Write a protein that binds this ligand. Structure first.
Ligand SMILES: [Mg+2]
Ligand SMILES: [Mg+2]
Ligand SMILES: [Mg+2]
Ligand SMILES: [Mg+2]
Ligand SMILES: [Mg+2]
Ligand SMILES: [Mg+2]
Ligand SMILES: [Mg+2]
Ligand SMILES: [Mg+2]
Ligand SMILES: [Mg+2]
Ligand SMILES: [Mg+2]
Ligand SMILES: [Mg+2]
Ligand SMILES: [Mg+2]
Ligand SMILES: [Mg+2]
Ligand SMILES: [Mg+2]
Ligand SMILES: [Mg+2]
Ligand SMILES: [Mg+2]
Ligand SMILES: [Mg+2]
Ligand SMILES: [Mg+2]
Ligand SMILES: [Mg+2]
Ligand SMILES: [Mg+2]
Ligand SMILES: [Mg+2]
Ligand SMILES: [Mg+2]
Ligand SMILES: [Mg+2]
Ligand SMILES: [Mg+2]
Ligand SMILES: [Mg+2]
Ligand SMILES: [Mg+2]
Ligand SMILES: [Mg+2]
Ligand SMILES: [Mg+2]
Ligand SMILES: [Mg+2]
Ligand SMILES: [Mg+2]
Ligand SMILES: [Mg+2]
Ligand SMILES: [Mg+2]
Ligand SMILES: [Mg+2]
Ligand SMILES: [Mg+2]
Ligand SMILES: [Mg+2]
Ligand SMILES: [Mg+2]
Ligand SMILES: [Mg+2]
Ligand SMILES: [Mg+2]
Ligand SMILES: [Mg+2]
Ligand SMILES: [Mg+2]
Ligand SMILES: [Mg+2]
Ligand SMILES: [Mg+2]
Ligand SMILES: [Mg+2]
Ligand SMILES: [Mg+2]
Ligand SMILES: [Mg+2]
Ligand SMILES: [Mg+2]
Ligand SMILES: [Mg+2]
Ligand SMILES: [Mg+2]
Ligand SMILES: [Mg+2]
Ligand SMILES: [Mg+2]
Ligand SMILES: [Mg+2]
Ligand SMILES: [Mg+2]
Ligand SMILES: [Mg+2]
Ligand SMILES: [Mg+2]
Ligand SMILES: [Mg+2]
Ligand SMILES: [Mg+2]
Ligand SMILES: [Mg+2]
Ligand SMILES: [Mg+2]
Ligand SMILES: [Mg+2]
Ligand SMILES: [Mg+2]
Ligand SMILES: [Mg+2]
Ligand SMILES: [Mg+2]
Ligand SMILES: [Zn+2]
Lengths: 99, 137, 99, 61, 83, 208
RNA sequence: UGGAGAGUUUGAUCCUGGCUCAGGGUGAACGCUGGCGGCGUGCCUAAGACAUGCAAGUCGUGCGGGCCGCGGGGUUUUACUCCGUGGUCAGCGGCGGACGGGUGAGUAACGCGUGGGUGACCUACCCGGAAGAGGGGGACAACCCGGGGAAACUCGGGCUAAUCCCCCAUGUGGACCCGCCCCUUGGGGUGUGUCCAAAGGGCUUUGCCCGCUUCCGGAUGGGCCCGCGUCCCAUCAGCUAGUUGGUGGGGUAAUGGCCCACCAAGGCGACGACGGGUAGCCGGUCUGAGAGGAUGGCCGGCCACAGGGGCACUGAGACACGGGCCCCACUCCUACGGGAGGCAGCAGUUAGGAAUCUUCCGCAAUGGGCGCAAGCCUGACGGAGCGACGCCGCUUGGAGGAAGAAGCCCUUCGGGGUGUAAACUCCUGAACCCGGGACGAAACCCCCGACGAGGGGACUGACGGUACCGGGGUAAUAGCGCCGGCCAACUCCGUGCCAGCAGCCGCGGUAAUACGGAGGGCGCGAGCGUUACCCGGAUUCACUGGGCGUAAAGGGCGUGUAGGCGGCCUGGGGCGUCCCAUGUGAA
């Protein structure tokens, strides 16, 4: 009747409480970073996606996400930042962009 | 037919208890039996295959009938006496299909307790007493 | 060893794609008769050079849609509109069998 | 259904196991009855087609 | 993991094993990759084993882990005997 | 268990004289003398011609009753006989003559098949120490066969080399009487293995 | 090294055509008989519901607590608190529950078989390697305390450890957007901006071993999609609106209307779309000379599901049988407040069915998982039992013994069958008893040796006191179906179109070779008849291998769409076709 393998739910909720708390910081900071690229302020979002970048690739050491998509959640961010900084954007160098 | 049966157990005063061994004289309860109904003998493996005594087959005949109290009770007596007439070893009636009054046979000759009480109390069918019919040669 | 199979253009009514059927020969596995059957293989046309009524060559690629797998590599010849009639008259022969 | 053999032992509420086949000279019958089931016992004095009509060994005396 | 073990292809009370290599996520009678060895325990047949002296170097070079009997019955074959 | 009962009964219905008792067969008391007719109280009936099924049925009896190997024991022997590559009606005869009933009996260690079947069946006649209680053994070409060392001085074996005190049996076997052994050399052919059986109308029946 | 035919329409014949039989096979069943072993198989129907037992746990070279034994100090070994070594309980954490086992309800589909692709992907424990193991902090189960709850259990205030998490220095390496070169579909390096490393433990204390992180490669297991084949019905002829296609975005490891907003009228189908019925597929199995036909019993590969449906987390790998949530139906307990829930895992119970079996023993061998090992679990499996479920093999004796004993049947009364059959002389003696005892087992574990290489030593059997060996020793089971023709085998008595046989022709009206009985004979033999299904017979769907004047058959006729084809000669392509080697057609 009883089984000692009920522990796996008590790692499932205990680690779901961590992963659910970590996955919001990718797209929340990413959409908040891509909004400021439309606003015009570049260095603010360039300060944002260093911490968001740290919360992508530093979160890529556990088991939340470390795949080719772990590179693409950052690649869509730094991809979609750089286009709209040309129509009167004055692209300076913060931390994210390499050029 | 020989099969493996045993798993011998019995009732206690309040619950069930199971025994591994059982010997002569003692009696008890057994599961796993297939089709040997009561009134029959089961013997061992290297047994002399002996059959017991007291196979109660008398031959009584009793003229009696029924009154099913309504006018459409033929289907319910014809449906209930099918499953009811199998416990009574005497079920030869030969009712002439001309009218109602579905006659049940007579074995114990006071057989309300085996047919009519087990039809009103057990099977929930109301009935009364009826009358037979003569036949001149 | 991706297969390189020749098809014919019968319709380019939808943009950025062509409706190409491929004729092929195979004997019957029981009666043994070389009969010609066809099956339409929708291919992508990014250059818009293959017009209506062409004979194209087909190479398989990574799929972009439901029911698209192939693309056009080369044209062998072109201009034979009579085979396009040899499909499309069967398109205007289906309406004569109805209620 | 058809009843084979020299008579039978059947009632109105009888459980009759069926076999099948056909009977040639009857208009609707296409079933046979195996004698040897617990409501259709075989006919006595039967020792030539004994397993076909379902009786045990005729005991000597 | 892919590793060498004994796959029993034998009848009742007549054992015969296959020194054979595939994934450990199969059953005993699984679809293997390459037949390389056989084995008869009852010692009635003098030709009771034959394990290749290059393909065992291939599978052990790409990292198969033999078990107890897959280790002793390949040790009796003599792969690691070069001195 | 192949057949137990009247065995000279099969000769009178069979026709041609059969050798299955030994001392009674070679003597003029094989019941073929003075009683030619098939058994039963019908017997000498009218001269009705047997049907074409019945003739090859009696040929199934002239291949089966003498050898004693029964029908379900026999269809498989015809099956690998047809599976072998060659004349199946000639390979099948020696193929049945590779068994420890008629290899031992053609070696002459018994007076009939009911002594070879039984004396091999109890486990006396051995293939080089490996004693075989089983006459269904397929005898290999060149197999030497001797009786048991306790069976070398029985009251029946001494009467079972009596007629074959150095008998020149044909070239499908060899024997040593003073060593009480033999050696089945090679498989016997069709005609020099001379037994009254026909070849042609057998595969015709067994293919139907 | 491969193929039977007959009965049957008619006064009689030929041809066409229908039906049946002689053969083989089953996850088969019924009846009768029944002795022993070996090897395979055992709910086909209700994928209906289930009492109870067992099937997935493991780690003290990871970590902290409670309880004992003995290692002990102001020990009355009550010692309560110093001390401390091994079990037990529970917890954090790592790995395995995606392996293995069972079923085919659903699915007509890239689901499956076959062959590839990925420039559109992953791969932990396996192996080859370039590096590392330095800092700080934090909380949660466990005990300290309290509450609630009949209970299972649950809720609050602090505590520390771990190989749990967070923040750093290091960045050889990898990743991201732009521009460069050989290939152009997202595949390889260079340059800068940023980001990402960890973890320690044990012993004999670095001599070593077990573990961890970035990354490269090779095996192995997977995901996706394509060419081909994939039941029947047209009395199912139009179907479809994320349906067809692009642009941009979100999600998956990865392409894809997988999902969303706009743009457009598209997409498929008489080469059978759509709709309905049926069905897991294949290697295989049965039959057949072959081509074919039926089917997916055991075993193996894949797919679908775990009472029906929907959904996500953890996990590399699941949308997960014994993991989680909700609805539906059902069972059980209740201190009538709330819970446990899912045997289509093994064995068993019940309903249904004619039909399907042990709540048997064990980790002795393999395999799977954990641990450095010692060892743990294995209803996978290794073995017996039950049921002649199928096959194989064997016994129920042997040699002699009469012109025919006795009993039984027929007779025209002589005789004939039973019949060498029986008793008798001799022999082997299956069962039965006594004694012995197995391959399956040498590995894991230690010793020498340089922790590898190599050699040596030690433990272990449910089967099983069984198979088997050496002797002694009893002649000791037999039935089933048929007997007019197909197709093997006939006399008498009673029945007089009644009882009955029956696959067909068809019999039984006082001589029934067709019924019941007696005898005899035939075929098989621990098996024989019967039923249901499949193939062949059947060329009776004809591709090999048929017809269309009269047996069934040419549309009432013509034009004409699609299709199938198609005069002569020359040249090219090598698509169809043929040949050679290889991959592959697993087992
Ligand atoms: Mg536990
Ligand atoms: Mg070794
Ligand atoms: Mg050695
Ligand atoms: Mg006798
Ligand atoms: Mg006519
Ligand atoms: Mg089923
Ligand atoms: Mg258990
Ligand atoms: Mg401790
Ligand atoms: Mg414990
Ligand atoms: Mg699970
Ligand atoms: Mg299965
Ligand atoms: Mg459908
Ligand atoms: Mg390693
Ligand atoms: Mg290193
Ligand atoms: Mg510190
Ligand atoms: Mg307390
Ligand atoms: Mg470094
Ligand atoms: Mg360095
Ligand atoms: Mg780098
Ligand atoms: Mg790089
Ligand atoms: Mg630069
Ligand atoms: Mg820069
Ligand atoms: Mg690791
Ligand atoms: Mg296809
Ligand atoms: Mg769709
Ligand atoms: Mg996934
Ligand atoms: Mg189905
Ligand atoms: Mg098939
Ligand atoms: Mg599934
Ligand atoms: Mg479900
Ligand atoms: Mg259920
Ligand atoms: Mg579930
Ligand atoms: Mg499972
Ligand atoms: Mg069960
Ligand atoms: Mg057990
Ligand atoms: Mg073990
Ligand atoms: Mg093990
Ligand atoms: Mg098993
Ligand atoms: Mg058995
Ligand atoms: Mg005799
Ligand atoms: Mg004697
Ligand atoms: Mg004696
Ligand atoms: Mg051990
Ligand atoms: Mg030492
Ligand atoms: Mg060694
Ligand atoms: Mg050694
Ligand atoms: Mg024991
Ligand atoms: Mg033992
Ligand atoms: Mg005697
Ligand atoms: Mg005849
Ligand atoms: Mg007849
Ligand atoms: Mg045929
Ligand atoms: Mg045919
Ligand atoms: Mg015709
Ligand atoms: Mg006419
Ligand atoms: Mg006509
Ligand atoms: Mg035309
Ligand atoms: Mg043409
Ligand atoms: Mg031409
Ligand atoms: Mg040319
Ligand atoms: Mg080609
Ligand atoms: Mg194969
Ligand atoms: Zn004779």
């Amino acid at each position: 009747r009883n089984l000692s393998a009920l522990k796996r739910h008590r790692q499932s909720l205990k680690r779901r409480l961590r992963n659910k708390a970590k996955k919001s910081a990718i797209k929340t900071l990413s959409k908040k970073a891509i909004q400021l690229a439309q606003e015009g302020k570049a260095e603010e979002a360039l300060k944002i996606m260093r911490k968001a970048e740290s919360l992508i690739d530093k979160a890529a050491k556990g088991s939340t996400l470390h795949k080719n998509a772990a590179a693409r959640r950052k690649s869509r961010l730094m991809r979609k930042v750089r286009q709209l900084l040309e129509a009167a954007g004055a692209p300076l160098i913060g931390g994210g962009l390499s050029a | 037919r020989k099969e493996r049966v045993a798993r011998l157990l019995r009732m206690h005063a309040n619950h069930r208890e199971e025994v591994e061994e059982l010997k002569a004289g003692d009696l008890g309860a057994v599961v796993g039996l297939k089709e040997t109904i009561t009134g029959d003998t089961l013997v061992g493996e290297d047994a002399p295959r002996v059959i017991l005594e007291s196979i109660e087959v008398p031959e009584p005949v009793i003229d009696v009938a029924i009154e099913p109290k309504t006018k459409a009770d033929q289907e319910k007596l014809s449906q209930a006496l099918a499953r009811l007439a199998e416990e009574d070893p005497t079920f030869r009636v030969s009712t002439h299909p001309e009218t109602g009054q579905t006659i049940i046979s007579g074995m114990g000759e006071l057989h309300l307790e085996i047919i009519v009480d087990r039809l009103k109390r057990e099977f929930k069918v109301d009935a009364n007493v009826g009358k037979p019919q003569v036949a001149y040669r | 060893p991706k297969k390189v199979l020749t098809g014919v253009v019968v319709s380019d009514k939808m943009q950025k794609t062509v409706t190409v059927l491929v004729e092929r020969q195979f004997p019957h596995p029981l009666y043994g008769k070389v009969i010609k059957r066809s099956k339409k293989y929708l291919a992508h046309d990014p250059e818009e050079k293959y017009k209506l009524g062409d004979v194209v060559e087909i190479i398989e690629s990574r799929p972009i849609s439901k029911r698209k797998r192939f693309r056009v590599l080369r044209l062998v010849e072109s201009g034979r509109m009579d085979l396009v009639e040899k499909y499309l008259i069967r398109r205007q022969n289906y309406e004569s069998l109805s209620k | 259904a058809y009843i084979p053999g020299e008579g039978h032992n059947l009632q109105e509420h009888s459980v009759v196991l069926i076999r099948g086949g056909r009977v040639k000279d009857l208009p609707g019958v296409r079933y046979h009855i195996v004698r040897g089931v617990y409501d259709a016992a075989g006919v006595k004095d039967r020792k030539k087609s004994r397993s076909k009509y379902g009786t045990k060994k005729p005991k000597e005396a | 993991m892919v590793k060498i073990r004994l796959a029993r292809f034998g009848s009742k009370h007549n054992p015969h094993y296959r020194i054979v290599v595939t994934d450990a996520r199969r059953k005993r009678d699984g679809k293997y990759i390459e037949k390389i060895g056989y084995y008869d325990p009852r010692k009635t047949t003098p030709d009771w084993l034959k394990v290749d002296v290059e393909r065992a170097r291939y599978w052990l070079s790409v990292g198969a882990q033999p078990t107890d009997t897959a280790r002793r019955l390949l040790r009796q074959a003599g792969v690691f005997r070069q001195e | 268990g192949r057949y137990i009962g009247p065995v000279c009964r099969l000769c009178r219905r069979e026709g041609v004289k059969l050798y299955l008792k030994g001392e009674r067969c070679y003597s003029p008391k094989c019941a073929m003398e003075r009683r030619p007719y098939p058994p039963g109280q019908h017997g000498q009936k009218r001269a009705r011609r047997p049907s074409d099924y019945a003739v090859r049925l009696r040929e199934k009896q002239k291949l089966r009753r003498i050898y004693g190997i029964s029908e379900r024991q026999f269809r498989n022997l015809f099956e690998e006989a047809s599976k072998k590559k060659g004349v199946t009606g000639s390979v099948f005869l020696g193929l049945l003559e590779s068994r420890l009933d008629n290899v031992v009996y053609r070696l002459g260690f018994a007076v009939s098949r009911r002594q070879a079947r039984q004396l091999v069946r109890h486990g006396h006649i051995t293939v080089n120490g490996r004693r075989v209680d089983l006459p269904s053994y397929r005898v290999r070409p060149g197999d030497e066969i001797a009786v048991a060392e306790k069976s070398r001085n029985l009251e029946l074996i001494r009467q079972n080399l009596e007629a074959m005190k150095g008998r020149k049996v044909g070239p499908w076997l060899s024997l040593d009487v003073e060593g009480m052994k033999g050696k089945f050399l090679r498989l016997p052919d069709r005609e020099d293995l001379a037994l009254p059986v026909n070849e042609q109308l057998v595969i015709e029946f067994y293919s139907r």
